[PDB]
């Protein structure tokens, strides 16, 4: 059978909780290439003739890992079907050691749809507007009981 | 220069220690430590390793892991 570290996946966010997380994440889609290009062209045209940081989800594996271990990230999403499993084996344990809540979601393809990329294998959010801060906090609190308390014996099931 | 501790690297190594569990030879070594003594554990490690210093360091690492386990 698989080692105890493996099979920690296959226990993931449920349809309701996953749908809620996607709905919350869908409100922070990062600016795509076309949107950024048109915005910059409009700004240049305005300048030629004569705002705070843009809140967005963090999805880069290196960027997400750097955010973790610094307590900046408030929530982290983990892809379960990552082909190089070694890239993701340490992420759950590292987050638990750092105390950062995380929720595993099935499908790297599904995860990537929220950032206009084919696959990202990871997703996280640090900045959040006031209108969504309460929703993010409630989702984080719910995820605790949904996952951590339901799989306290994840070390079993070789 | 010298190999500074680099606390970040120490934490990463400690986390990897738990993530990777123990190798089957490491499992045998710790089982013999808990049931056959560090005296025999060091000899087993030396038979399964090179210089005696490396075996002693490994035995110390296993002892530290056992102590941290409880």
């Amino acid at each position: 059978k698989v080692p105890p570290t493996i099979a920690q996946f296959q226990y993931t966010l449920d349809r309701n909780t996953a749908a809620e997380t996607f709905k919350l994440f869908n409100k922070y889609r990062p600016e795509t290439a076309a949107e950024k290009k048109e915005r910059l062209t409009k700004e240049a045209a305005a300048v030629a003739e004569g705002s705070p940081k843009p809140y967005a989800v963090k999805y880069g594996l290196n960027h997400v890992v750097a955010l973790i271990e610094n307590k900046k990230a408030k929530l982290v999403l983990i892809a379960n079907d990552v082909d190089p499993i070694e890239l993701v084996v340490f992420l759950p344990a590292l987050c638990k050691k750092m105390g950062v809540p995380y929720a595993i979601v099935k499908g790297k393809a599904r995860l990537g749809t929220l950032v206009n990329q084919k696959t990202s294998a990871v997703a996280a959010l640090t900045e959040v507007r006031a209108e969504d801060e309460a929703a993010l906090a409630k989702l984080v609190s719910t995820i605790d009981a949904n996952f951590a308390d339901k799989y306290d014996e994840v070390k079993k099931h070789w | 220069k010298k190999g500074a501790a680099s606390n970040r690297t120490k934490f990463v190594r400690s986390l990897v220690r738990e993530i990777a569990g123990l190798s089957p030879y490491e499992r045998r070594l710790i089982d013999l430590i808990r049931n056959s003594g560090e005296k025999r554990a060091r000899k087993v490690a030396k038979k399964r390793l090179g210089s005696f210093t490396r075996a002693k360091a490994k035995v110390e690492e296993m002892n530290n892991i056992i102590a941290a386990s409880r």
Partner: peptide, 15 residues
């Protein structure tokens, strides 16, 4: 050979 893992390190949250 087949025993549960131990959270000796992950038990304490980083401050």
């Amino acid at each position: 050979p087949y025993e549960p893992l131990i959270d000796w390190f992950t038990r304490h949250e980083e401050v």
